[PDB]
């Protein structure tokens, strides 16, 4: 109903999010890359102006 065979609702949310947190490591990887991109783009703003 909503509290009967609750251990079967429990297993599908647990499974599904576990798969996505691997793929959500690839999105923080991206955060890390674009911290560097702006530093490379700041020297290239300088070179373009040069």
């Amino acid at each position: 109903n909503n509290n009967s065979a609750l251990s079967n609702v429990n297993s599908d949310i647990y499974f599904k999010l576990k798969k996505l947190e691997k793929e959500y490591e690839l999105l923080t990887l991206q955060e890390d890359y674009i911290k560097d991109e702006q530093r490379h783009l700041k020297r290239e703003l300088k070179r373009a102006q040069e």
Binding site: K22, E23, L26, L27, L29, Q30, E37, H40
Partner: protein
């Protein structure tokens, strides 16, 4: 092959050698790691052009985070045209299984107005979502 690449003076032969090393170190992941480091360390563009592809094929279809990081850094950080291009195309091979993440990672490269980058960005969407279309992929290519 690696050493012969420096001996040869014909450019086509270097190109051919560089990517063919990638093909031999296919499917071998973290055992190919030593080779990856020499190819990137070079001052010859062809050795870097092939360097990107070695990461792509060894870590192919497994979304290993270390592989994607190298390919990203190198794409941006080298001024040499072949070198840039090659790194971008490499991403699709790696992220073949988890193509969910590909359009959001490569939005960046299509933002930038360098042409060689942009050529490879398209190709990366081509490879990655080859199997089945992703509506987002098409939208970024328009």
């Amino acid at each position: 092959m690696f050493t012969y690449s420096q001996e040869t003076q014909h450019g086509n032969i270097t190109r051919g050698l560089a990517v063919g090393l990638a093909l031999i170190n296919y499917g071998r992941q973290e055992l190919a790691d030593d080779l990856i480091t020499k190819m990137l360390a070079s001052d010859e563009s062809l050795l870097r052009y092939g360097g990107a592809f070695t990461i792509a094929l060894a870590y192919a279809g497994t979304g290993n985070n270390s592989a994607v990081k190298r390919l990203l850094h190198v794409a941006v950080s080298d001024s040499n045209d072949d070198v840039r291009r090659a790194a971008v195309i490499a991403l699709g091979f790696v992220l073949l299984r988890d193509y969910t993440t590909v359009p959001r990672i490569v939005q960046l490269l299509s933002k930038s107005h360098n042409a060689h980058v942009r050529c490879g960005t398209a190709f990366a969407l081509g490879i990655a979502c080859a199997g089945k279309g992703l509506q987002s992929a098409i939208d970024v290519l328009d």
